[PDB]
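S.,

As promised, the magnesium ion run. Input:
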Amino acid sequence: QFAYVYDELMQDVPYPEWVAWVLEQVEPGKRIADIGCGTGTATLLLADHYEVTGVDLSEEMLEIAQEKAMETNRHVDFWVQDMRELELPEPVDAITILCDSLNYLQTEADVKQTFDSAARLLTDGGKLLFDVHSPYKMETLFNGKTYATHAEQSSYIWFADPGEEPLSVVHELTFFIEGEDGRYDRVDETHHQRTYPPEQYITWLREAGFRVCAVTGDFKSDAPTETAERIFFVAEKI
Ligand SMILES: [Mg+2]
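Predicted complex:
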């Protein structure tokens, strides 16, 4: 299951900080759809406070998500769906799109489609929460940088370079996965991310029928600083 290489890459990602933030905006016990959930690490933490449903385009990642849920006796439905065309049968009180998952969208249209889909799934008062890269992060940490590390089962080399569009990044990943015989299998992947100034996102949210409640930086209560790396949005369906 190749998907575990992602769990190792993020073993030190402080997911409980995202969960603590969701807890400030959505009352525990409510129903949440966590979209673009990957291997569901944050989704499973959310399941400890909310009735949660996870959605991602990757069957492989959702398989790991499910196995982890079953091994910890959590009930969490994971379904394969594209965030721009969400469709859930039961009502949800909030939608979460965490850890820059929204940034994998490639066009302005994709983002508007995602927001419209979110609005259709929520009723009056439902919340939409997401965090994204700031323009500053794109221009610094993803501006021709190299990242690499070793975990127990795999090692990776990650190059982060500007893409063709403004505020875009091309992540060139190479994983060396250890096999049963102690030798390594290489897997190369290319991921694309794109961001926008926060004001562009606020406009789209309003066009999609949301009231923007808060725009904050780096897990703090205040508006983003000019050197903020991650921007958090809280919006509510009108
Ligand atoms: Mg209202």
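Residues 124-125 surround magnesium ion (CB under 6 Å). The helical segments are 4-9, 15-25, 41-46, 59-71, 108-121, 135-140, 198-207.

- D.
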